[PDB]
Amino acid sequence: NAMNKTELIKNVAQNAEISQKEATVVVQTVVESITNTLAAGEKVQLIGFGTFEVRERAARTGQTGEEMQIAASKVPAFKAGKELKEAVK
């Protein structure tokens, strides 16, 4: 089935033929790196894969009927590259 964090680490250890601990260090690093880049408002390309950035948002309007005004916000965003789009289709 699916692949959680612990599953991914163990698949990286197996496939890169490094150890359980090294694999943990690398995946933890990928996670923390992207988080630290986006928190800084910056962009990060993980090539073969895609791009992570911060996407500025302004107010949509937007189930009682109501068009409440939702506030402007920064959210995270991922832009899949060509390789990822071709693997998955």
Next chain:
Amino acid sequence: TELIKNVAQNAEISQKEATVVVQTVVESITNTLAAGEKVQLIGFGTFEVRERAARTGRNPQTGEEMQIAASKVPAFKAGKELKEAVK
């Protein structure tokens, strides 16, 4: 390449090995997504494949019928920990 720098630094290996190792991460994730399954990362977020069935629609120009093809879109859902850092 700041990312590859953090890996070489935190794992204590060559930039070239950090390359290779990061490629492996990209591939598992890509392979799971390619199989229709999800990749779920505690305290970061989830990747998944947004599947949409063939539909028959309507040409916006002519009111004439229009097949709309099936699709498969790679998606990422950020979790709370990532959303909050970003705001």
